[PDB]
Design a protein around this ligand. Structure first.
Ligand SMILES: C[C@@H](C(=O)N1CCOCC1)N1CC[C@H](NS(=O)(=O)CCc2ccc(Cl)s2)C1=O
Ligand SMILES: [Ca+2]
Ligand SMILES: [Mg+2]
Lengths: 234, 52
């Protein structure tokens, strides 16, 4: 995350971190339930074997709430395509259930029509992660969050060198130095409505981080609500 | 601005229009209150709430 603020105690409890064999985070995820994590399909190619860490805000100290979970099943969307990142979504079933507590809780899945008309028409959403704090930097050792405006769909397509499919949406800033960045991929984009936070996107891609005239591109979770539901029933 | 377009039809969460009236509902892990509008967590750590 470029810009934004640190997630304070209890503020981003649905954040998950995909960690490689070396205990290093490479992607984020969103806690959907005691057994399931939502992430980006492209993240699945960035490590041979990985686990999921929850309840962590500082990778340099033991806060007492952290928990590592092994993955039992990876459910990657079959229409995912590496050439465009269309259908950039996967669900992970964990071997053991997450025990909710301070800093560990799920985000809500909304209904499609209401989310599109009411949540995605709000001024902003919130993206979070342990990704780089600058395009050329190191990963953050602190979990960060950032309020990101939803961006007009026509404006986004005009701004992009790569296709924006029906499965994607744009969020962020034209020139302000604030955006998600490398290492945030697969992480949560949530929208607050009356103090309840609903999952609205998955950090997917961007032409660099916080570039002028470029926005963050997110998987449109509302296009995948039935698919998520199915993946979580088996 | 009518029904669900008017302040979310007074619903805490999901709002649907049926036979020209508002019907509220809630995310999994919440129960619709007696007023048919508010959503009440069914147990601890309900989805979408910051922890303290
Ligand atoms: C343009 C895109 C890319 O290679 N794609 C996207 C279209 O499909 C083909 C692959 N790309 C190239 C470099 C870039 N990698 S990255 O900087 O790690 C991302 C960081 C992000 C910024 C904002 C969001 Cl959301 S996440 C990235 O995502
Ligand atoms: Ca820690
Ligand atoms: Mg920009």
């Amino acid at each position: 995350i470029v810009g934004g603020q640190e997630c304070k105690d209890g503020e981003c409890p649905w954040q998950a971190l995909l960690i490689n064999e070396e205990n290093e985070g490479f992607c984020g995820g969103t806690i959907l339930s005691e057994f399931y994590i939502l992430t980006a399909a492209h993240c699945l190619y960035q490590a041979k074997r990985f686990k999921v860490r929850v309840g962590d805000r500082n990778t340099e100290q033991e806060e007492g709430g952290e928990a590592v979970h092994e993955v039992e099943v990876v459910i990657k969307h079959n229409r995912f395509t590496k050439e465009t990142y269309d259908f950039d979504i996967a669900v992970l079933r964990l071997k053991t259930p997450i025990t909710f507590r301070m800093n560990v809780a799920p985000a809500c899945l909304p209904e499609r029509d209401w989310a599109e008309s009411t949540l995605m028409t709000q001024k902003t959403g919130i993206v979070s992660g342990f990704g780089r704090t600058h395009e050329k930097g190191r990963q953050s050792t602190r979990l960060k969050m950032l309020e990101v405006p939803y961006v007009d769909r026509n404006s986004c397509k005009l701004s992009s060198s790569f296709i924006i499919t029906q499965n994607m949406f744009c969020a962020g800033y034209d020139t302000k130095q604030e955006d998600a960045c490398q290492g945030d991929s697969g992480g949560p984009h949530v929208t607050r409505f009356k103090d309840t936070y609903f999952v609205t996107g998955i950090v997917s891609w961007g032409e660099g981080c916080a570039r002028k005239g470029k926005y963050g591109i997110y998987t449109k979770v509302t296009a995948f609500l039935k698919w998520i539901d199915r993946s979580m029933k088996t | 601005r009518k029904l669900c377009s008017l302040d979310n039809g007074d619903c805490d969460q999901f709002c649907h229009e049926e036979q020209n009236s508002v019907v509220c509902s809630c995310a999994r892990g919440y129960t619709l209150a007696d007023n048919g509008k508010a959503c009440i967590p069914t147990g601890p750590y309900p989805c979408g709430k910051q922890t303290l």
